[PDB]
């Protein structure tokens, strides 16, 4: 039965990614001005299934490095929905947010290995700069994560989903949460913040995207947990994660890519004092409001 838990965890995320591709193409069309895909298949679902099939059919380093980059990217994509408390998480990790950070770092490894095995100097310097702007935001992500769980005591994240029954945690740290959400945009490598098997590489990218969406929805807000009926909590949680993913599309389809030096200059000299000042305020302040959270 535990193997059935495993398969229901790691198989339907692939269907989730494929239907995310159709949703982002459709909604970005309706943003832009486009019906479509609506011709191949009823309302475009056979179209992404055929996308994945056709990309599997085609007939395209150091086969060590050439295979060890996408195998690591996609095993990260599989392993990284382990402790997310869709009410009962699959493994009750006593500390999981540090696991989130560590596997972001492993994704950095995957991109660097594929860039090394690309073996062409323009792609090499491009992958190098992409590694630097992937690594340049795991500072801010870590420190904001630190300050938002300092309000809630423990790394366990189940205590977090307890503590967000009273208020949505977007209120008692809104600018901190906003800066974390911009750093999720940076870590997902999408607009504004910017060879094979592209199916695997693409797949790992979008699974990391939906991971950050779900982790945003769990880390900051949620619904009241019904005793002995978690279906309603799962419904409202999933709808909030989907509305944030549509909001993520909504930010995608409207802004140009930054210049790379503007990106770094913006990160250091604009996030990094402001994150530090907000984080020291969340250090010094719960000791001033007679409120330190109970690590159990």
């Amino acid at each position: 039965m535990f193997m059935i838990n495993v398969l229901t965890l790691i198989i339907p995320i692939l269907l989730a990614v494929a239907f995310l591709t159709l949703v982002e193409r459709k909604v970005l069309g309706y943003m832009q001005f486009r019906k479509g895909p609506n011709v191949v298949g009823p309302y475009g679902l056979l179209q992404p299934i055929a996308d994945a099939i056709k990309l599997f059919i085609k007939e395209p380093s150091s086969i060590s490095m050439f295979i060890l980059a996408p195998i690591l990217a996609l095993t990260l994509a599989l392993t990284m929905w382990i402790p997310l408390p869709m009410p009962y998480p699959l493994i009750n990790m006593n500390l999981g947010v540090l696991f989130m950070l560590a596997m972001s770092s492993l994704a950095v490894y995957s991109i660097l290995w594929s860039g090394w095995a690309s073996n062409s100097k323009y792609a090499l310097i491009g992958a190098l700069r992409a590694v630097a702007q992937t690594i340049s935001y795991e500072v801010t992500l870590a420190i904001i994560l630190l300050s938002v769980l300092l309000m809630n005591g423990s790394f366990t994240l189940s205590t977090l989903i307890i503590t967000q029954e009273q208020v949505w945690l977007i209120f008692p740290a809104w600018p901190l949460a906003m800066m974390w959400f911009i750093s999720t945009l940076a870590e997902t490598n999408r607009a504004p913040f910017d060879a094979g098997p592209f199916a695997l590489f693409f797949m790992a990218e979008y699974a990391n995207i939906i991971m950050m969406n779900i982790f945003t929805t769990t880390l900051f807000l949620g619904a009241f947990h019904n005793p002995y009926m978690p279906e309603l909590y799962t419904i409202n949680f999933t709808i909030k994660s989907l509305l944030l993913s549509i909001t993520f599309l909504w930010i995608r389809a409207s802004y140009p890519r930054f210049r790379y030096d503007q990106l770094m200059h913006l990160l250091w000299k604009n996030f990094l004092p402001l994150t530090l000042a907000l984080c020291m305020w969340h250090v010094s302040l719960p000791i001033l409001l007679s409120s330190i959270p109970p690590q159990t």
């Binding site: 838990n5 339907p12 309302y43 679902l45 279906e231 999933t238």
Partner: protein, 70 residues
């Protein structure tokens, strides 16, 4: 409008709904109707361990309550 985008969004919303609901279904199914315990600390592990010891069936969910009194 959105009149042709809610099919894909609805199907993908079911496809994201399914692992949590199936996991809760299996957590209730694989405990005799109870909830799985969560021992973060060694104290709750010892408490759970003596619980599965005194059930006799090597299965703690039975919990043999107020029946081995006298």
């Amino acid at each position: 409008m959105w009149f042709e985008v809610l099919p894909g969004i609805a199907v993908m919303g079911v496809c994201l709904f399914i692992p949590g609901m199936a996991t809760a279904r299996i957590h209730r199914f694989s405990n005799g109707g109870r909830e799985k315990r969560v021992a973060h600390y060694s104290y709750q592990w010892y408490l759970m361990e003596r619980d599965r010891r005194v059930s006799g069936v090597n299965r703690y969910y039975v919990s043999k309550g107020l029946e081995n009194i006298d």
